[PDB]
């Protein structure tokens, strides 16, 4: 019939084409109502502070603080050197250094050989 | 040099004998007078350096660093007087004494004729900086920051000391003027290899070299505002100054000893700039941008051409002004929202339009908009590295893409979009704050009219 | 089905307060009171 | 803010998973951490990897430009999935078919520019004729030397 | 000499004077936009005098008036090149900008920051004339990055809109990718020719000019939105309509083309660079005119129109016709700025409606906008003896009768038919038929600013190709002998485009509903290039920016190998040294072991 | 899926949202008003055929293949209203929507330029700070134990009370400030 939508990492599945969107089961209703309850509690807790006349400042979000703490300070306490982190740390850490070393070294050896053999055109090159 | 050293020391009785309401005004006034006085160092010659005495000299490398150093002290006092308003009076005077003492150590770091006196002033700068960070920094991590800043330096600099004393035993002198004429070639050997590392790694830590840079996004982030201003604007440039002096003695071994470090810098400026694309802390983003900018100065000093040294000293002066202004802008938002999270306070151009114009100008100078001296230094380093190897333009040009991308992202996140609804303490910009921004930005833009004074000794 | 009566009542009261607020954004005929040039 | 509301280590026991689900303001049945492979995520939730563009724009968001509520657990790459940046929204054409069509179009055009370069068009004319030995002195030829005579005839 | 150089510098200083006025102000201005518009009309009048005395004698000069900086053998001076390119581009840019600003006094009247808008628009004009009047690469780079930054600030004019900020940063990103090639060219010319001045570049005339011309072609690909670096120009329609009319149609986006016209003594001796420019321009003019066939936002259609015209300019550079390319710049400025101004008149009369599916019936309701839109669409498609005829028809005749990549010629002709197709798409959905806009009609174009600003570009779009093409000196030999099917190629292809798209437009009224094909979805979703490349390339960068660079290296491994392992080692050695049980017996037993190792094992007693 | 009051969409709400999306995409495909009007009546006839369907599994199946029908037949560039999300004028004026609290930071010389406005602003501020404690104690005497279930707020129940959490709804900026 119709071409089936193939979702990707950068093009997700639509809400209207997802089979779990049409679940009418009571456990999904309980999960949706419990998510609505958490969101309504956080909403009320936010807008009781947001609408306060005496408040003058920043309504601190512990979710934002929690995110910025996870992105920076919690990383090394939760690092374990294993096969994955060592093979990724050495591929992306010293791999490009070896690569650009051999590229620039081969280029400058070739250019130095051409200059000392009098082959590189260096006719008007006096700024360096 | 003693016409600058003695007024800088006279700032100490000036701050300790001032009336309690006058200690910012008096030190600001007389440090501005010292900074006006610093232009007499522009008596530079096309052949000779300005050689005052046996102890002090000033060529066209040290002179702009001195003028920038003496200029940064009033701006640090203006930046720091607001958040230290509730401080004890004696601790306030001790803070100003640490800034004065740091200026005193810096101005005879840059003018030290002899290299071991350079070493002693160079390492003497650590103690006021460590005290400022660990005593007047805001958070817990300042203590850990004070350790990293202390121990990446000394572990690099204690082999330098030995190396310098070895030169003292070999050449008979560490006078830089004598070493200009008595320099002997340094051949390929293992002894000269570790001689090269001992001469270079302390300054590699100070720049910082990529991979050795980890002290900086703790030390510049956890510092107070004057600490971050002097760390980014001056103390990184002790490494570049020291390299430009010390690589006289390291030829011709540098021609292959530079190859790893150049790689560490050329890829490192790709890494740290990319890191700036995903920084959530604004002050950390400015710190990583400093690592990325100093990577070019490392490459330019290691390839040691005239164009590269001219670009490296122009880029050091330009980065000093730009990074100090960027830390002051980030502090002006921190002193309102009390968080360094960049995504927190958004849409600030709707609330603070003139400060948004300062953000715009500092971002444009950060991305090296021509004809700023940022672009002059950037471009001259790119010319010299293209002559070094034509492939470097890839890693150069890609850097200039990413440098634009994090500069405007910082400008788009904080200034543009919708303002945060729940933040209602965004005060209008104080005259002190706009003054601080203009005293960074107006000299930076006026140096584009006459950039030859910041092009160094081989202009 | 449309609103609940609580939603109708809350929107009516917010509507009255909002229209009072928007009426209070009009200037007086003397405003803006400028300094003498 | 305090210590038991900050992120911590990876949750192993189910009561630790429950209390860290309570910390990030979300259900235990919805809380999934990143897999404990030592990359440094800790107990931080693996949220479903969607852009903020996919959020409902008509909802009363606390942060309307970000489409994000207060207290909602932010994605690890929230600064990456802002609407200024990476969009993951569903596309009218499938991703693989888009890649096939774009690559096929670009490759076909480059191939046909190569073909037309190998077989160029021209006009049924001879070469353009210039006097004075094909303008030898005008093109920068030195006057002390003398070139071969380039002679053009009438036709 | 003294008249020429003085009025040359008076034009530029006069443009800088309202910037000095707005920066030195205390009051609320009595119509600062009128002052900037009066200043630019006067700069047009002042720039016409050196233009006339170039038309008289061919009088050219270089004003190297301020020595700025000598880097040992590179003397950098503030140097202005008053040649044919500056002498024609400066009056055309000033005339177009004067119409854009009298349009902006109407279109931006509700804007509370209209003085900042006119300040930014004048700063763009100053940086653009710095670009086109420059004699060295550093000053050209100042103008180049300056028009990039004013493009950023004017695309993101409504800065609370996320799409405006995204489009502005996208324009920056693609132009910095081109600036890689610009700085490559500057590096090559400095290292190999010891200069950034154009005169020493042209006098040395290097034969190995592959790499600097590849850099210049990359710079033009960024700046003129050629294929690969194209989508920022349709994204740049997020800015206000005078920004799209001034910068992104007529003045800024030709700068890359202008750059390759400025280096024509190098491109004329490099057949490889000519073939690269030819294939790149033909690719661009096919692809963007194909994308324009199915768009519905009127500014997107005009943006793909001007990127197709920039592709045509790149084609006529690639066939070694740089003066026809410059003629097409000066010609294209008039009618394309006027087409954006007519679109903005429609958008303002329909309450910021920009989709052509909610237009229609505007033939009689907006008669002056209709007249000027039809005249501009005929000038765009190369109606005979309108302004686009005097450049584009010569471009097609020269591309036919030359030693050319035949696929590039054929794609240029298919793009020429596509121009007629999207031009009548504009005329059909915007002007013809019956209304599709909402019921409260606020249609009004009776402002003197709107009428006069469209009127001067209308007189331009009628007569400027004739006047310029009869005033400029011959710089090549025009090919005027060709067979009848090859002389009549452009007109026949344009007429076939009009006929075929009349068929396409009349099939829209039929009561048939077909599912869209893959060709329609390829044209409509922009060849899938901004969908893939703007999702995939940021993703792979930003993950790499956080996972590898931030987390793995500079929070973990560069933290692990130097400081953390050293600290753990010194902690472990500290705990081994200080784990002594306080027993005198064990310490003296260690002293005995010390003496035995010193005597027997180390021989410290010999 | 994601709604402030309801926890989900009902089947009837899903059908009506599909019907509106399908008519808007059909109008994008079918530009002219008579041609749209014909095909919109045909689409309404397709929706009225299965309107009286009592089997909810059959109705859910019809809704699911109708969503597949829509996803195949949608317009690649549908018409978006200009101030609507994704529109060309969406969130354009947010840079001009200065919040009201910034008026508290004005200098007295520029507050004196608008005497009647700020005199009228102060009685709004007085009304808000005398209404705040009554509306907080209204919310806490009406929210059940464990927190609110939905995000709906109650109205004012007494004569003299204002609705709870009203200030940023009432004093929000204009769409054209
Ligand atoms: C030795 C004597 C020297 C005399 C000449 C001066 C030389 C330059 C010095 C520095 C000048 C900067 C001062 C203005 C900017 C900062 C303050 C500000 O924003 O005020 C806004 C305010 C007006 O705005 P507003 O409406 O009231 O409020 C602002 C809004 O909130 C919203 O604001 P906004 O965003 O709408 O408007 C900001 C706008 C934003 O616009 C931009 O950001 C776009 C700019 C970039 C693109 C366009 C330029 C590209 C490059 C071309 C120009 C350079 C080369 C030109 C030569 C030909 C080609 C080679 O910026 C401007 O319009 C400023 C115009 C000048 C820009 C200079 C370049 C900055 C870009 C970044 C670095 C680029 C390289 C360095 C160039 C250095 C050249 C010397 O201006 C003032 O009130 C000015 C106050 C007085 C300024 C004095 C300047 C000199 C100070 C030096 C003192 C000592 C020497 C004595 C000389 C005194 C002369 C009078
Ligand atoms: C910031 C972290 C990294 C810091 C790196 C600092 C530099 C790294 C290299 C330092 C080497 C040691 C000092 C060398 C001084 C050179 C002086 C000289 O004349 O050398 C030639 C002399 C030669 O001896 P000589 O000169 O007496 O002999 C006469 C000359 N010939 C050889 C011809 C007969 O070299 C040496 O004597 C030894 C040099 C190597 C020393 C090896 C031991 C130290 C290893 C490195 C330790 C680095 C720091 C470790 C801590 C890290 C952090 C906790
Ligand atoms: C409204 C104010 C205007 C002036 C009002 C009062 C005067 C009234 C009218 C009389 C005119 C004044 C007398 C004549 C002027 C002075 C003439 C003279 O010899 O001046 C000495 C010199 C002329 O140059 P010079 O070659 O003699 O000296 C330069 C100095 N050395 C040699 C050391 C390099 O300086 C000037 O004139 C300075 C003004 C320059 C004007 C342009 C400024 C552009 C700024 C751009 C900054 C960035 C550039 C980067 C790019 C550069 C290119 C790559
Ligand atoms: C190698 C390797 O596989 O190391 C794994 C090992 C831990 O092994 P595990 O997986 O725990 O069993 O892990 C280890 O032995 C510790 C790490 C090994 C050394 C890694 C060196 C390179 C790290 C990146 C440096 C980037 C700069
Ligand atoms: C490039 C240079 C690489 C080396 C840099 C120096 C080591 C790293 C920086 C200094 C130590 C950082 C730090 O704070 O380490 C903390 C750790 C535990 O110390 P603790 O008392 O727990 O901390 C205070 C309470 N949180 O402290 C420890 O475990 C002890 C650390 C001792 C450091 C001594 C370094 C000596 C170097 C020469 C060795 C031979
Ligand atoms: C992680 C954070 C980021 C990094 C911070 C900085 C750390 C790195 C600092 C040192 C960089 C590497 C060392 C310098 C390399 C310079 C060139 C060199 O030595 O080449 C390798 C050498 C080639 O041999 P050859 O040139 O013949 O040497 C004999 C000289 N008579 O090859 C050999 O002889 C083989 C190897 C021998 C062992 C060398 C060990 C000492 C040097 C490294 C310490
Ligand atoms: C003559 C030769 C001609 C050669 C032509 C072909 C060469 C180039 C090939 C393509 C490379 C560039 C294109 C890919 C990057 C494009 C990035 C971009 O524009 O992203 C836009 C994206 C959102 O835009 P969009 O979704 O369209 O907006 C709709 C409203 N939400 O916005 C975002 O997602 C924001 C992301 C910000 C960070 C971007 C990180 C990526 C940076 C890539 C740098 C590449 C450098 C290449 C260097 C080459 C050196 C020679
Ligand atoms: C310019 C020269 C114009 C005159 C020569 C071409 C005339 C022509 O072939 O016209 C065909 C066509 C009108 O005929 P058609 O639309 O097929 O039938 C409807 C009855 N009026 O279509 C047209 O007349 C429209 C095409 C006009 C193109 C003018 C710009 C070139």
Angle among Cα B170, B172, B174 to the nearest 5 degrees reads: 100
List of chain B residues whose C-beta atoms are within 8 Å of the C-beta of residue D70: 422
Q: How was this structure determined?
A: cryo-EM
How far, in Å, CA of F131 to CA of E302, rounded?
A: 55
How far, in Å, CA of E580 to CA of B17, rounded?
A: 54
| Best C13, C22, C26 residue to mutate vs chain F (most F CBs within 10 Å) | C13
How far, in Å, CA of B239 to CA of B201, rounded?
A: 9
Long-range Cβ contact pairs of B289-292 (< 8 A, separation 24 or more): B289/B323, B289/B326, B289/B366, B289/B403, B289/B406, B289/B407, B290/B216, B290/B220, B290/B232, B290/B236, B290/B319, B290/B323, B291/B208, B291/B210, B291/B213, B291/B216, B291/B217, B292/B268, B292/B399, B292/B403
How far, in Å, CA of D18 to CA of E63, rounded?
A: 77
Give the strand pairing for E74-82 and B57-58: unpaired
E269 in Cβ contact with E324 (< 8 Å):
no
User: Could you tell me the two tokens for B87?
Assistant: 């401080």
Say whether the peptide bond before residue E189 is cis (omega within 30 degrees of 0). Answer: no
Torsion of CA E187, E191, E193, E198, to 10 degrees: 20
Instruction: Phi first, then psi: give them for residue B132, nearest 5 degrees.
Output: -65, -45
Bridge partners of E80, per DSSP, are: E63, E134
Distance of CA E467 to the CA centre of its chain: 27
Query: Nearest to residue E253, comparing CAs of E235, E270, E276?
Result: E235
Q: How many of the other CB atoms lie within 10 Å of CB of E16?
A: 13
Instruction: Phi first, then psi: give them for residue E301, nearest 5 degrees.
Output: -65, -45
DSSP 8-state secondary structure symbol assigned to residue E136: B
Say whether the peptide bond before residue B396 is cis (omega within 30 degrees of 0). Answer: no
E457 in Cβ contact with E338 (< 8 Å):
yes
Q: How many of the other CB atoms lie within 10 Å of CB of A27?
A: 9
Query: Nearest to residue F17, comparing CAs of A15, A19, D60?
Result: A15
Cα-trace Rg, chain B: 21
Place of tokens 């798409």: E425
Cα-trace Rg, chain A: 30
Runs of H (alpha helix) within B223-370: 225-230, 236-246, 254-276, 282-303, 306-337, 348-351, 353-366
Query: Nearest to residue E239, comparing CAs of E185, E320, E168?
Result: E168
Query: Nearest to residue E91, comparing CAs of E46, E33, E131?
Result: E46
Instruction: Phi first, then psi: give them for residue E67, nearest 5 degrees.
Output: -65, 120
Reduced to 3 states, what is the DSSP secondary structure of residue B252? strand
Query: Nearest to residue B355, comparing CAs of B274, B254, B430?
Result: B430
How far, in Å, CA of E275 to CA of E320, rounded?
A: 10
Q: Give the number of the atom of ligand 5 that is nearest the alpha carbon of residue B212.
A: 1
| Best A51, A55, A56, A58 residue to mutate vs chain F (most F CBs within 10 Å) | A51
How far, in Å, CA of B229 to CA of B219, rounded?
A: 11
Q: What is the largest CA-CA distance in chain C?
A: 61
B41 in Cβ contact with B58 (< 8 Å):
yes
Cα-trace Rg, chain C: 18
User: Could you tell me the two tokens for E403?
Assistant: 């030693």
Resolution (A): 2.5
CB-side neighbour CA atoms (13 Å) of C12: 10
Helix (H) or strand (E) run with residue E65 in it: strand E61-71
Chain A and chain D share a number of CB contacts under 8 A equal to 126
D33 in Cβ contact with D10 (< 8 Å):
yes
DSSP 8-state secondary structure symbol assigned to residue C31: -
Q: Which residues of E157-171 are buried (b: 16+ CB within 10 A; e: fewer)?
A: bbbbbbbbbbbbbbb
List of chain A residues whose C-beta atoms are within 8 Å of the C-beta of residue D56: none
Place of tokens 């958070």: B139
Reduced to 3 states, what is the DSSP secondary structure of residue D83? coil
How far, in Å, CA of B45 to CA of B57, rounded?
A: 13
B219 in Cβ contact with B231 (< 8 Å):
yes
Bridge partners of D68, per DSSP, are: D63
Q: Quote the minimal CA–CA distance from C36 to chain F in Å.
A: 12
Query: Nearest to residue E305, comparing CAs of E291, E289, E319?
Result: E289
Place of tokens 């075929």: E500
How far, in Å, CA of D43 to CA of D10, rounded?
A: 4
Inspect the structure and tell me whether chains D and C have 3 or more CB pairs less than 8 Å apart: no
Which residue from F4, F74, F85 is facing D60, i.e. has the nearest CB? F4
Q: Give the number of the atom of ligand 6 that is nearest the alpha carbon of residue B260.
A: 11
Bridge partners of B51, per DSSP, are: B57
Query: Nearest to residue E73, comparing CAs of E197, E184, E214, E199?
Result: E197
A124 in Cβ contact with E192 (< 8 Å):
yes
Query: Nearest to residue F133, comparing CAs of D145, A52, D141, E547?
Result: A52
Cα E78 to ligand 3 centre (Å): 9
How far, in Å, CA of B428 to CA of F106, rounded?
A: 9
How far, in Å, CA of F106 to CA of B361, rounded?
A: 26
Bridge partners of B175, per DSSP, are: B114
Q: Which residues contact C21 (CB under 8 A, 6 or more apart)?
A: F124, F170, F171
Instruction: Phi first, then psi: give them for residue E209, nearest 5 degrees.
Output: -95, 30
How far, in Å, CA of F64 to CA of E166, rounded?
A: 35
Q: Inform me whether the C-beta atom of residue E558 falls under 8 Å from chain A C-beta atoms.
A: yes
By a Cβ cutoff of 8 Å, what residues of chain A touch chain D?
3, 5-14, 17, 31, 34-35, 38-39, 42-43, 45-46, 50, 59-67, 69-71, 74-82, 84-85
DSSP 8-state secondary structure symbol assigned to residue D88: -
Which residue is closest in CA terms to ligand 3's atom 20?
Answer: E66
Q: In Å, what is the CA distance from B233 to each residue of B66, B74, B138, B163, F63?
A: 12, 14, 20, 27, 65
Runs of H (alpha helix) within chain D: 14-23, 95-118, 131-135
Task: For helices E32-57 and E2-23, give the axis angle rounded to 10 degrees.
Answer: 170
Residues in chain C: 37
Q: Which residues contact F141 (CB under 8 A, 6 or more apart)?
A: none
E157 in Cβ contact with E240 (< 8 Å):
yes
Say whether the peptide bond before residue B371 is cis (omega within 30 degrees of 0). Answer: yes
Q: Where are the domains of chain B?
A: 1-459
Give the strand pairing for B57-58 and B50-51: antiparallel
How far, in Å, CA of E168 to CA of E243, rounded?
A: 12
Residues in chain E: 606
DSSP 8-state secondary structure symbol assigned to residue F156: -
Q: In Å, what is the CA distance from F152 to each residue of A33, A50, B81, D26, E129?
A: 14, 16, 48, 20, 59
Q: Inform me whether the C-beta atom of residue F15 falls under 8 Å from chain E C-beta atoms.
A: no
Long-range Cβ contact pairs of C29-36 (< 8 A, separation 24 or more): C30/F115, C30/F116, C31/F113, C31/F114, C31/F115, C31/F116, C31/F117, C32/F113, C32/F114, C33/F112, C33/F113, C33/F114, C33/F115, C34/F113, C35/F109
Q: What is the DSSP string of chain A?
A: -PPPP---SSSPPPSTT-GGGG---HHHHHHHHHHHHHHHHHHHHHHHHHT-SS--S----HHHHHHHHHHHTTTGGGB---HHHHHHHHHTTTHHHHHHHHHHHHHHHHHHHHHHTT-S--SS----
Which residue is closest in CA terms to ligand 3's atom 28?
Answer: E67
User: Could you tell me the two tokens for E198?
Assistant: 């154009």
Query: Nearest to residue B367, comparing CAs of E540, E172, E120, E229?
Result: E172
Pocket of ligand 3 (CB under 6 A): B 371, 448-449; E 66-68, 76-78, 136, 138-139
E177 in Cβ contact with E229 (< 8 Å):
yes
Place of tokens 């009785």: B13
| Best D49, D61, D74, D85 residue to mutate vs chain E (most E CBs within 10 Å) | D85
Instruction: Phi first, then psi: give them for residue D41, nearest 5 degrees.
Output: -85, -30
Residues in chain A: 128
Say whether the peptide bond before residue B252 is cis (omega within 30 degrees of 0). Answer: yes
How far, in Å, CA of E207 to CA of B425, rounded?
A: 64
User: Could you tell me the two tokens for B183?
Assistant: 């320099």
Q: Is the dihedral of CA E22, E25, E26, E32 positive or negative?
A: negative
D23 in Cβ contact with D1 (< 8 Å):
no
User: Could you tell me the two tokens for F90?
Assistant: 């969406």
DSSP 8-state secondary structure symbol assigned to residue E210: H
Among D84, D90, D107, the mutation site with the greatest number of ligand 7 atoms within 8 A of its Cβ is D84
Residues in chain B: 459
Q: What is the DSSP string of E427-475?
A: HHHHTSSS--S-SS-------HHHHHHHHHHHHHHHHHHHHHHHHSPP-
Q: In Å, what is the CA distance from B367 to each residue of A47, B364, B403, E285?
A: 40, 5, 6, 32
Bridge partners of E404, per DSSP, are: D121
Nearest residue on chain D to A6, alpha-carbon basis? D94
Q: In Å, what is the CA distance from C34 to each residue of B270, D9, F114?
A: 56, 63, 9
Torsion of CA F28, F30, F31, F37, to 10 degrees: -110
How far, in Å, CA of B293 to CA of B287, rounded?
A: 10
Torsion of CA B114, B116, B118, B124, to 10 degrees: -150
Q: How many of the other CB atoms lie within 10 Å of CB of B248?
A: 12
Q: Inform me whether the C-beta atom of residue B387 falls under 8 Å from chain A C-beta atoms.
A: yes
Q: How many of the other CB atoms lie within 10 Å of CB of D44?
A: 25
Among E496, E498, E501, E506, the mutation site with the greatest number of ligand 8 atoms within 8 A of its Cβ is E498
How far, in Å, CA of B24 to CA of B18, rounded?
A: 9
CB contact under 8 A, F1 and A53: no
Q: Which D residues in the span 73-102 are in contact with B, Cβ-Cβ below 8 Å? A: 78-80, 84
Q: Which residues contact B338 (CB under 8 A, 6 or more apart)?
A: A58
Distance of CA B425 to the CA centre of its chain: 32
């Amino acid at each position: 019939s119709f071409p089936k939508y193939e979702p990707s990492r950068l093009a997700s599945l639509p809400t209207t084409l997802d089979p779990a969107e049409y679940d009418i089961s009571s456990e999904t209703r309980k999960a949706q109502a419990e998510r609505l309850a958490i969101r309504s509690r956080l909403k009320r807790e936010y807008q009781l502070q947001y609408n306060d006349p005496s408040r003058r400042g920043v309504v601190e979000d512990p979710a934002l603080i929690r995110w910025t703490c996870a992105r920076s300070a919690n990383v090394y306490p939760n690092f374990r050197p294993n096969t994955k982190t060592s093979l990724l740390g050495a591929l992306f850490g010293i791999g490009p250094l070896i690569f650009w070393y051999y590229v620039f070294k081969t280029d400058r050896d070739r250019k130095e050989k051409l200059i000392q053999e009098g082959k590189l055109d260096r006719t008007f090159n006096i700024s360096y | 040099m003693l016409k600058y050293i003695i007024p800088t020391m006279m700032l100490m009785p000036l701050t300790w004998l001032s009336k309690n309401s006058m200690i910012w005004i008096n030190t600001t006034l007389h440090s501005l007078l010292i900074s006006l006085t610093s232009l007499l160092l522009l008596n530079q010659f096309g052949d000779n350096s300005l050689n005052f005495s046996l102890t002090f000299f000033s060529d066209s490398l040290s002179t702009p660093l001195l003028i920038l150093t003496m200029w940064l002290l009033p701006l640090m006092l203006m930046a720091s007087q607001h958040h230290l308003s509730k401080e004890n009076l004696a601790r306030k005077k001790l803070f100003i004494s640490m800034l004065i003492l740091l200026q005193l150590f810096l101005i005879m770091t840059f003018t030290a004729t002899e290299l071991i006196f350079f070493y002693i002033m160079f390492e003497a700068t650590l103690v006021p900086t460590l005290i400022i960070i660990t005593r007047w920094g805001n958070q817990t991590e300042r203590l850990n920051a004070g350790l990293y800043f202390l121990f990446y330096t000394l572990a690099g600099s204690l082999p330098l000391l030995v190396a310098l004393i070895y030169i003292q035993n070999t050449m008979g002198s560490l006078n830089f003027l004598i070493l200009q004429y008595w320099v002997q070639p340094m051949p390929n050997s293992w002894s000269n290899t570790f001689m090269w590392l001992a001469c270079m790694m302390a300054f590699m830590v100070k720049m910082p070299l990529y991979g050795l840079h980890l002290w900086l996004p703790k030390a510049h982030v956890e510092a107070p505002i004057a600490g971050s201003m002097v760390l980014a604007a001056i103390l990184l440039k002790l490494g570049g100054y020291g390299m430009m002096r010390i690589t006289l003695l390291l030829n011709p071994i540098t021609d292959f000893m530079a190859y790893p470090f150049i790689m560490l810098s050329l890829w490192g400026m790709i890494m740290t700039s990319s890191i700036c694309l995903r920084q959530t802390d604004l002050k950390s983003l400015i710190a990583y941008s400093s690592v990325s900018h100093m990577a070019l100065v490392i490459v330019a000093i290691l390839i040691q051409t005239p164009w590269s040294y001219m670009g490296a000293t122009a880029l050091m002066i330009a980065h000093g002004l730009t990074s100090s202004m960027l830390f002051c802008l980030a502090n002006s938002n921190y002193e309102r929202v009390h968080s360094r999270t960049m995504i927190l306070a958004r849409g600030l151009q709707t609330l603070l339009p003139l400060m948004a114009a300062w953000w715009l100008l500092a971002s444009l100078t950060n991305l090296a908009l021509p004809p700023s001296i940022n672009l002059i230094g950037e471009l001259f380093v790119v010319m010299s590295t293209f002559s070094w190897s034509n492939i470097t333009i890839i890693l150069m040009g890609l850097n200039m893409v990413i440098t634009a991308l994090y500069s405007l992202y910082m400008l788009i996140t904080t200034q543009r979009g919708k303002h945060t609804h729940h933040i209602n303490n965004i005060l209008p910009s104080f005259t002190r704050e706009n003054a601080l921004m203009s005293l960074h930005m107006l000299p930076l833009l006026l140096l584009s009219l006459n950039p030859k004074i910041i092009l160094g000794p081989l202009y | 089905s449309g609103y609940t009566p609580d939603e109708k009542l809350r929107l009516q009261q917010l509507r009255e307060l909002r229209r009072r607020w928007l009426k209070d954004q009009e200037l007086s005929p003397r405003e803006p009171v400028l300094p003498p040039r | 803010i305090t210590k038991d509301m900050l992120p911590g280590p990876y949750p192993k026991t189910p009561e630790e998973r429950a209390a860290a689900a309570k910390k990030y303001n979300m259900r235990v049945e919805d809380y999934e951490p990143y897999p404990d492979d030592g990359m440094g995520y800790g107990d931080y939730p693996k949220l479903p990897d969607r852009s903020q563009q996919e959020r409902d724009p008509w909802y009363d968001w606390d942060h309307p430009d970000l489409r994000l509520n207060w207290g909602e657990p932010m994605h690890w790459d929230l600064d990456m999935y802002i609407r200024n940046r990476v969009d993951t929204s569903p596309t009218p054409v499938n991703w693989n078919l888009m890649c096939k069509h774009l690559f096929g179009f670009v490759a076909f055009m480059l191939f046909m520019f190569w073909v037309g370069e190998t077989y160029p068009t021209y006009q049924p004319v001879g070469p353009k004729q210039y006097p004075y030995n094909n303008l030898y002195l005008e093109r920068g030829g030195d006057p002390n030397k003398e070139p071969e005579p380039v002679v053009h005839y009438e036709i | 000499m003294n008249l020429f150089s003085s009025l040359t510098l008076v034009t530029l200083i006069l443009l800088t004077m309202p910037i000095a006025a707005i920066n030195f102000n205390t009051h609320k201005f009595t119509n600062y936009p009128l002052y900037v518009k009066t200043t630019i009309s006067c700069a047009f009048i002042t720039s016409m005098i050196p233009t006339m005395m170039f038309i008289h004698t061919g009088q050219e000069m270089i004003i190297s008036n301020w020595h700025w900086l000598t880097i040992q053998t590179l003397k950098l001076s503030l140097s202005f090149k008053m040649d044919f390119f500056s002498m024609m581009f400066v009056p055309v840019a000033l005339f177009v900008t004067w119409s854009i600003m009298e349009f902006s006094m109407w279109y931006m009247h509700s804007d509370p920051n209209i003085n900042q808008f006119f300040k930014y628009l004048l700063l763009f004009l100053i940086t653009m004339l710095i670009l086109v009047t420059a004699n060295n690469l550093f000053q050209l780079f100042i103008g180049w990055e300056g028009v990039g930054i004013m493009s950023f600030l004017l695309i993101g004019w409504w800065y609370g809109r996320t799409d405006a900020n995204t489009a502005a940063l996208q324009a920056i990103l693609y132009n910095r990718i081109g600036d890689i090639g610009f700085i490559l060219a500057m590096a090559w010319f400095l290292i190999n020719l010891n200069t950034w001045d154009l005169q020493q570049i042209f006098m040395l005339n290097p034969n190995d000019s592959n790499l600097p011309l590849m850099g210049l072609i990359l710079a033009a690909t960024g700046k003129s939105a050629q294929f690969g670096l194209h989508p920022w120009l349709p994204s740049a329609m997020e800015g206000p309509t005078p920004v799209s009319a001034l910068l992104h149609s007529s003045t800024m986006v030709v700068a890359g083309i202008f750059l390759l016209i400025r280096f024509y003594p190098l491109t004329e001796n490099n057949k490889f660079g000519q073939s690269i420019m030819l294939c790149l321009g033909a690719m661009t003019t096919l692809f963007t005119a194909m994308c324009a066939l199915t768009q519905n936002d009127i500014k997107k259609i005009i943006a793909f129109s001007t990127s197709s015209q920039l592709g045509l300019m790149m084609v006529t550079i690639g066939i070694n016709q740089p003066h026809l390319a410059f003629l097409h710049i000066c010609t294209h400025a008039f009618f394309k700025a006027m087409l954006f101004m007519c679109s903005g008149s429609i958008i303002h009369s329909l309450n910021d409606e920009q989709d052509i599916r909610k237009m229609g019936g505007l033939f009689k309701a907006m008669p002056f906008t209709t007249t000027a839109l039809i005249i501009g669409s005929l000038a765009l498609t190369g109606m005979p003896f309108l302004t686009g005829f005097y450049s584009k028809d010569l471009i097609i005749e020269s591309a036919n009768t030359s030693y050319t990549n035949a696929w590039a010629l054929l794609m240029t002709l298919v793009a020429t038919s596509f121009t007629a197709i999207y031009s009548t798409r504009i005329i059909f959905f915007a002007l013809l038929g019956q209304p599709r806009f909402p019921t409260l009609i606020n249609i009004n174009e009776n402002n003197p600013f709107l009428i006069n600003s469209i009127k001067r570009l209308l007189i331009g779009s009628l007569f400027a190709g004739f006047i310029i093409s009869n005033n400029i000196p011959p710089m090549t030999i025009p090919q005027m002998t060709m067979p009848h099917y090859l002389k009549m190629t452009a007109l026949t292809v344009t007429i076939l485009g009009f006929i075929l798209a009349l068929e396409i437009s009349n099939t829209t009224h039929y009561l048939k509903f077909n599912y869209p094909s893959n060709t329609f979805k390829f044209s409509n979703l922009l060849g899938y290039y901004p969908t893939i490349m703007h999702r995939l390339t940021p993703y792979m960068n930003l993950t790499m920016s956080q996972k590898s660079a931030s987390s793995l290296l500079d929070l973990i491994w560069l933290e692990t190998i130097l400081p953390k392992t050293i600290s753990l080692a010194q902690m472990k050695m500290s705990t081994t040294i200080t784990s002594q049980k306080g027993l005198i017996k064990l310490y003296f037993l260690s002293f005995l072991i010390t003496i035995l190792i010193s005597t027997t094992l180390l021989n410290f007693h010999e | 899926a994601f709604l402030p009051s309801a926890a989900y969409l009902t089947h009837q709400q899903k059908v009506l949202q599909l019907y509106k999306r399908a008519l808007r995409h059909l109008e994008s495909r079918c530009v002219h008003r008579d041609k749209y009007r014909y095909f919109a009546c045909l689409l309404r006839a397709r929706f009225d055929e299965h309107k009286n369907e009592k089997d909810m599994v059959k109705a859910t199946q019809l809704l699911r293949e109708a969503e597949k029908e829509f996803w195949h037949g949608q317009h690649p560039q549908p018409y978006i209203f200009p101030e609507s999300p994704g529109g060309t004028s969406y969130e354009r004026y947010e840079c001009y929507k200065v919040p009201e609290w910034c008026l508290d930071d004005w200098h007295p010389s520029e507050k004196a330029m608008y005497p009647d406005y700020f005199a009228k602003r102060e009685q709004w501020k007085k009304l808000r700070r005398e209404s705040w404690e009554r509306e907080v104690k209204q919310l806490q005497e009406e929210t059940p134990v464990g927190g609110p279930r939905t995000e709906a707020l109650p109205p004012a129940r007494k004569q003299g009370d204002l609705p709870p959490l009203w200030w940023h709804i009432v004093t929000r900026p204009r769409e054209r400030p």
